[PDB]
Amino acid sequence: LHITEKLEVLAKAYSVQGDKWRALGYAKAINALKSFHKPVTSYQEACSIPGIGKRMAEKIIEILESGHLRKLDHISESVPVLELFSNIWGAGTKTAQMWYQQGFRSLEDIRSQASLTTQQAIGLKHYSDFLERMPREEATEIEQTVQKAAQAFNSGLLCVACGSYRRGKATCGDVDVLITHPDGRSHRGIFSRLLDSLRQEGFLTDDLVSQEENGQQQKYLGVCRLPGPGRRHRRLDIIVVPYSEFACALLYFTGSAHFNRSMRALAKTKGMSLSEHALSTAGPGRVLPTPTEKDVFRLLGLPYREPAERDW
DNA sequence: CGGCGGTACTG
DNA sequence: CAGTAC
DNA sequence: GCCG
Ligand SMILES: Nc1ccn([C@@H]2O[C@H](COP(=O)(O)OP(=O)(O)OP(=O)(O)O)[C@@H](O)C2(F)F)c(=O)n1
Ligand SMILES: [Mg+2]
Ligand SMILES: [Mg+2]
Numbered sequence A: 001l002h003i004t005e006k007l008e009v010l011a012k013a014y015s016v017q018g019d020k021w022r023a024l025g026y027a028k029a030i031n032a033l034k035s036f037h038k039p040v041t042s043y044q045e046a047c048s049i050p051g052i053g054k055r056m057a058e059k060i061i062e063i064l065e066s067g068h069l070r071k072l073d074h075i076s077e078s079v080p081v082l083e084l085f086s087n088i089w090g091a092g093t094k095t096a097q098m099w100y101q102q103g104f105r106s107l108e109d110i111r112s113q114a115s116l117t118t119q120q121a122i123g124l125k126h127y128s129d130f131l132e133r134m135p136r137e138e139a140t141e142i143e144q145t146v147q148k149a150a151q152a153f154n155s156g157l158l159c160v161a162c163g164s165y166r167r168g169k170a171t172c173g174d175v176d177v178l179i180t181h182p183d184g185r186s187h188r189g190i191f192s193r194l195l196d197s198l199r200q201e202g203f204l205t206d207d208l209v210s211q212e213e214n215g216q217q218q219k220y221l222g223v224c225r226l227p228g229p230g231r232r233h234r235r236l237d238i239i240v241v242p243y244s245e246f247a248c249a250l251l252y253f254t255g256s257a258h259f260n261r262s263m264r265a266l267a268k269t270k271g272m273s274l275s276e277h278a279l280s281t282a283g284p285g286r287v288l289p290t291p292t293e294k295d296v297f298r299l300l301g302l303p304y305r306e307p308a309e310r311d312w
Numbered sequence B: 001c002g003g004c005g006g007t008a009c010t011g
Numbered sequence C: 001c002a003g004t005a006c
Numbered sequence D: 001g002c003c004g
């Protein structure tokens, strides 16, 4: 806390206005300022911290000394509105800035005047719902609904809830279901059947991303709702992967996002490349053998981590 | 200087 | 493609 | 913004 509470509003201001690299820098400086054993008190001290350069140091000496940070006085008043628009699924910083330039200030303005993509229209229709977390118990019910429908046309299908669910969180922003088949081939063409089964029973309410004319579809992003009173619309993400990519896909879909980024960053320093598909060597490199998550960790020179230890 | 993760849709 | 998303 |  302290200096960090002021750096954070700045970091978010930069993020929502699209300065993602500078926001990134603020993020990492804030982390470093979160785990330093002591209240920094000197320019020299701050600078000695990995993640904190001269500039960020300049701004720390200004905080606990004058109590203020003049930079916060220069945050565009547009920022709260950019964040409002930005929270619409399918609208990012470019779209929000454009709406704002065109004079849009409220979701009512958006509803009545903006031209919305199909995704943004669904995003708007479920604005509040997409901003809530569900109890992990609800994520379980949702994943089982998907699994039960999948196992209907092929009981061999492996279905696994990933993301914050697999990391053990008490609540989940949505449900991430990884689907594969141990025989290494029966995963092909399952999306059509699965999705239609799920539509058939009124489980799926909206589709956000779903290239079903592509026999090579990898992902489904959309919306579902369990039956009964007091149910909310929930975001559901499904990926279907070849068994050969199981460990990398599992690792990717388990996150956290910051964890994946860090791990891929490490692979690169070691002459590798890590994706949801595989871990390979840096033109056509070599695909490395990764039958299990542990294999990816080992090859990177790391101690294995339980999903819950990946909650970065 | 130049990377900051690597990849899949949509229009 | 630029934009957005996982 | 920060890093090598
Ligand atoms: N920029 C991103 C976003 C996601 N993911 C990977 O895609 C997975 C799912 O994305 P999610 O469902 O949106 O984020 P969650 O962790 O489950 O937190 P919540 O419950 O609020 O959703 C991530 O775990 C991932 F593992 F993090 C990623 O690799 N890079
Ligand atoms: Mg999730
Ligand atoms: Mg998700």
Ligand code: NA
Residues within 6 Å of the ligand: A047, A048, A049, A050, A051, A052, A053
């Ligand atoms: Na430093």
Ligand code: NA
Residues within 6 Å of the ligand: A085, A086, A087, A088, A089, A090, A091, A092
């Ligand atoms: Na959005």
Ligand code: NA
Residues within 6 Å of the ligand: A207, A210, A211, A212
């Ligand atoms: Na479609």
Ligand code: NA
Residues within 6 Å of the ligand: A129, A231, A232, A233
């Ligand atoms: Na609802």
